[PDB]
Design a protein around this ligand. Sequence first.
Ligand SMILES: [Cl-]
Ligand SMILES: [Cl-]
Ligand SMILES: [Mg+2]
Ligand SMILES: [Sm+3]
Ligand SMILES: [Sm+3]
Ligand SMILES: [Sm+3]
Lengths: 146, 146
Amino acid sequence: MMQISSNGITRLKREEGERLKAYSDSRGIPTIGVGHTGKVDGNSVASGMTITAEKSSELLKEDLQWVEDAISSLVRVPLNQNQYDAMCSLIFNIGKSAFAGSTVLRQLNLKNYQAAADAFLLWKKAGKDPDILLPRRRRERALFLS
Amino acid sequence: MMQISSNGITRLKREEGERLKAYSDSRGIPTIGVGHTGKVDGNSVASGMTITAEKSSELLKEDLQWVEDAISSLVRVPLNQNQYDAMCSLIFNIGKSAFAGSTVLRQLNLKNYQAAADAFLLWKKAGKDPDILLPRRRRERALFLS
Ligand SMILES: [Cl-]
Ligand SMILES: [Cl-]
Ligand SMILES: [Mg+2]
Ligand SMILES: [Sm+3]
Ligand SMILES: [Sm+3]
Ligand SMILES: [Sm+3]
């Protein structure tokens, strides 16, 4: 079945940021790679853990299973690989419940692909800045339409 | 099985912050209550949604089930309610994986309850600030020991 591509992983890494040495996120959660909070090689992520870029990518591919599963369960129209990779990036950011209720999903399921692409641009607010995610949304939209 | 107390809910709300009007968090995820990002009454959280404090408590108890499950799974020794409530607050913050690997847990299962309490104070860093969570940890430690 369809899964994120290597291009999709590179682009997502470059939107999210990669950190190959464990750190504490802004809430206090030990994290490594691209948002990996679970174990690595059977150990809890903790200060002192390092990983390779290969490991970071393989951890991300596994952590995306909920995203891929959301696409499979909710999306009822065909997606090309660029569309799929762009959707993975959006959903990994905004989360499953936000995606489930989104205009992106509604439009895609109507086979209104251009309108679905445009509706990425709605997911632009974070905190006190109403458009800080808009550049990322524009890049994802461009990937979708590629 | 054990469950969080009313006092434990009140204290956790104080630590986390409760927001009765939907907002977009620092990452862009629609959120309401005490960190609830899932659906509310069957619908996605979205701008303009407001909930009551009692609904916020209901959603928090739903969102704490993984925390209570983690304590039940991992801790094999007796806990009084204050200890339990403090642990709920720590874990809800640092996550299950971090707790599973922690000195808090290892010490607790050895029945070194004072050493477990003091190990709360290790979970103090977030982002680039080495001690930003220390005041919260001290309050949780005080609850644990009370
Ligand atoms: Cl692993
Ligand atoms: Cl309500
Ligand atoms: Mg799947
Ligand atoms: Sm490999
Ligand atoms: Sm898997
Ligand atoms: Sm500080």
